């Protein structure tokens, strides 16, 4: 039981580190990139209308 416990904890430890460092910041950066383009399409339109 010990030897197995020793192997499984090593895998569970890698997964926490992976989701924390890689996954979450990728979701932040991608969201942001798209946000910045997106708001500008709505704004420029209003300026076009006004002109």
């Amino acid at each position: 039981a010990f030897i197995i416990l020793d192997e499984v904890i090593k895998v569970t430890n890698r997964r926490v580190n992976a989701i924390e460092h890689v996954i979450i910041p990728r979701t932040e950066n991608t969201i942001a990139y798209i946000n910045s383009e997106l708001d500008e399409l709505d704004r420029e339109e209003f300026y076009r209308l006004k002109k």
Binding site: V11, R15, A18, I19, I23, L41, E45, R48, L49
Partner: protein, 457 residues
């Protein structure tokens, strides 16, 4: 009368209030060439015209106009096949003009004798991934969604070469009995590829059966948009008067969309979301209108529009609006292309919502609609299992999922893959579907009624 001004490529005429709407006017320029333009709008003591040849040369006081008195209409013959035209139907080979037996309107709004009988008989394009999954019916218009990073021009080409070689397969199926003719319209496409299209018609031996309208990007914007309307009108004449099965292949919608966009930069009409006109929908719908079973119900026009996504996403204005007007969509994808697949067709967002009703057992089989339904569910799981496989490890896998991972690859590399010259029987397609499904027990199936399954599996 005379030019007051020119604003962008749009030319502002000052003129007296008499012209027809969409009336051709001829602008006399001092350079030995007279050109035609069409009043885009008629207004109070002025009209704004975009001139169909060139974009420069208009002068203030050195210009003369004379009103033709006749709005543009396409002069139509059913002898127009076996001729090479440009975007105005003028010859480029000197000699073969459109000519006429009748004169019909470019919008096709006067005649519109489209049958109130829903797509009926089967059509194939000889590509298994198309035929089985999103099955084409005559009069059905289902778009080809592509993305650039692709040999998307090669996929269009493949379909053009394949169209008319399918037709003896279809005669035998009894989803065709009558002549097959091709109407081919080119907008903003490369030089090399224009020679590929001519060459594909030549091989087939359907050069006589086809009309080519060739329009480049160095030919004007307004003139680009007219081109498919000429083509379309001629197809409607083919379908109605002589009860033919007409396939018009209309490439490239994206080029057509830009052209619309460049205008309205001096019109009073204002542009909506993402700088696209709000009546862009209206423009697409005029093109799309000639498509459907004709009255006589022995002819039809089937329409295949070719769209390359210029940005790659499907929520971009060009694809988003089109998908709505049409009944389903067909997705080509970059990812398959990368592995080294041809024709690379992803089927997961691909669905045609009028597929089941059109088709029946007499030219397909009853299991055609069931066997397709099974293959989507299994492919979908295989795709999610793959994504999870990367992140967590093989910890989130389960027995069904491991089987699904293999299924994905099996399907991708045997089913979807085939040569350019290759064409496929629908009945054949269906035995290859069953084969892939043979690696799963039957208790795990549920998108097929147990009666149906027992017969063909």
């Amino acid at each position: 009368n005379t030019v007051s001004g020119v604003n962008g490529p749009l030319v502002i005429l000052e003129k007296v209030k008499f012209p027809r709407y969409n009336e051709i006017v001829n602008l006399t320029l001092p350079d030995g060439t007279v050109r035609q333009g069409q009043v885009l709008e008629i207004r109070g003591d002025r009209a704004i015209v975009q001139v169909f040849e060139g974009t420069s040369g208009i002068d203030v006081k050195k210009t003369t106009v004379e009103f033709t008195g006749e709005s543009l209409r396409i002069p139509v013959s059913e002898d127009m096949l076996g001729r090479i035209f440009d975007g105005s139907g003028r010859p480029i080979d000197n000699g073969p003009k459109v000519f006429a037996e009748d004169y019909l309107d470019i919008n096709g709004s006067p005649i519109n004798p489209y049958a109130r009988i829903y797509p009926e008989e089967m059509i194939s394009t000889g590509v298994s991934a198309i035929d089985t999954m999103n099955s084409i019916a005559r009069g059905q218009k289902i778009p080809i969604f592509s993305a650039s990073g692709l040999p998307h021009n090669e996929i269009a080409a493949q379909i053009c070469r394949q169209a008319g070689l399918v037709r003896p397969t279809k005669d035998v199926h009894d989803g065709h009995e009558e002549n097959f003719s091709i109407v081919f319209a080119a907008m903003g496409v490369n030089l090399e590829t224009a020679r590929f299209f001519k060459q594909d018609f030549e091989e087939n031996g359907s050069l006589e059966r086809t009309s080519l309208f060739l329009n480049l990007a160095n030919d004007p914007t307004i003139e680009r948009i007219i081109t498919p309307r000429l083509a379309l009108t001629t197809a409607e004449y083919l379908a109605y008067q002589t009860e033919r099965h007409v396939l018009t292949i209309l490439t490239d919608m994206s080029s057509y969309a830009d052209a619309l966009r460049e205008v309205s930069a001096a019109r009073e009409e204002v542009p909506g979301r993402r700088g696209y006109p709000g009546y862009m929908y209206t423009d697409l719908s005029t093109i799309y209108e000639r498509a459907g079973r004709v009255e006589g119900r022995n002819g039809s026009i089937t329409q295949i529009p070719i769209l390359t996504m210029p940005n790659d996403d499907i929520t971009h204005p060009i694809p988003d609006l089109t998908g709505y007007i049409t009944e389903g969509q067909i997705f080509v994808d970059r990812q398959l292309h990368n592995k080294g697949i041809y024709p690379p067709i992803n089927v997961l967002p691909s669905l045609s919502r009028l597929m089941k009703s059109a088709i029946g057992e007499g030219m397909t089989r009853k299991d055609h609609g069931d066997v397709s339904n099974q293959l989507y569910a299994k492919y979908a799981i295989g795709k999610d299992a793959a994504a999870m496989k990367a992140v967590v490890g093989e910890e989130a896998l389960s027995i069904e999922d491991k089987l699904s991972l293999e299924f994905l690859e099996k399907f991708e590399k045997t089913f979807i893959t085939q040569g350019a010259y290759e064409d496929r029987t629908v009945f054949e397609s269906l035995d290859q579907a069953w084969s892939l499904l043979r690696i799963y027990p039957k208790e795990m199936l549920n998108r097929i009624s147990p009666k149906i399954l027992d017969e063909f599996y």
